[PDB]
Design a protein around this ligand. Sequence first.
Ligand code: CL
Ligand code: CL
Ligand code: MG
Ligand code: ZN
Ligand code: ZN
Length: 299
Amino acid sequence: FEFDNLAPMLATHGTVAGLKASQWAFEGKWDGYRLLVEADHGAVRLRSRSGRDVTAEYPQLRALAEDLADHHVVLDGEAVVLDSSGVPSFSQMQNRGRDTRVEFWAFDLLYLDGRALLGTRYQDRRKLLETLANATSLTVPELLPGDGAQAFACSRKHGWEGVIAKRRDSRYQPGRRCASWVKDKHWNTQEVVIGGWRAVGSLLMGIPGPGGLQFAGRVGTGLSERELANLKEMLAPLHTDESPFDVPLPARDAKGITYVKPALVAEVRYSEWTPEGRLRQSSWRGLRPDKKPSEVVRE
Ligand SMILES: [Cl-]
Ligand SMILES: [Cl-]
Ligand SMILES: [Mg+2]
Ligand SMILES: [Zn+2]
Ligand SMILES: [Zn+2]
């Protein structure tokens, strides 16, 4: 066990709805600096996610190590600066001053009082982490209740960005992006090509593929009836005689359609993908004129 050999375990981008609590623990996903912390009987050493020794950058985490002075521990967690709603924030961290309060939100325990825990399964490491949290002033955010969807909704209600789901049977793999950690944000972003519009109520999105655009759904949230009229104006120069989609559109979506040349990229916000390659809960984030349809890719 060499603390200066350790690098953070990493999460796989994915979906948590459908995951079962009996197999997965659900943690809130926050923005901040990932930190490995050694608190050795009062002394503190800190490593950034890239392995730099950042001990001197956080003098205030000395108090943490003193509070944990009965123990020698290695902790994984997130250094965080909260906004006024109490939610960790990236720009608050970026704009940090000498006096701004930085909290350390712990979410793994890698070593405890002589015992190394990399080979120990999450369920068990987590139980020990809680014990520390209950006996000292270490901040250990709580797990989210329920199965995937419920946990996701809880996270949302906290104002949090998303969930990291971790397999209860899983070991800690330093430096590795692992399928046993899945990270999922409430809101995501995707570039799309506009293939048409529909009665104006909405726009038709697609992803370039073999034989044309793969249909991605429709978008007309994030905008009003005035803005819709504008898009109709802007897009007229681009009417076409070929459908840009690889395959006939579904009937609902085909009713009252005007195809345009697949020339324009938009950015859209959305929740998740559907099994048939559609984007749920789309909202408009604007055309992106300098972007190329040919480099639009499912991100
Ligand atoms: Cl990650
Ligand atoms: Cl942007
Ligand atoms: Mg060494
Ligand atoms: Zn984030
Ligand atoms: Zn963007």
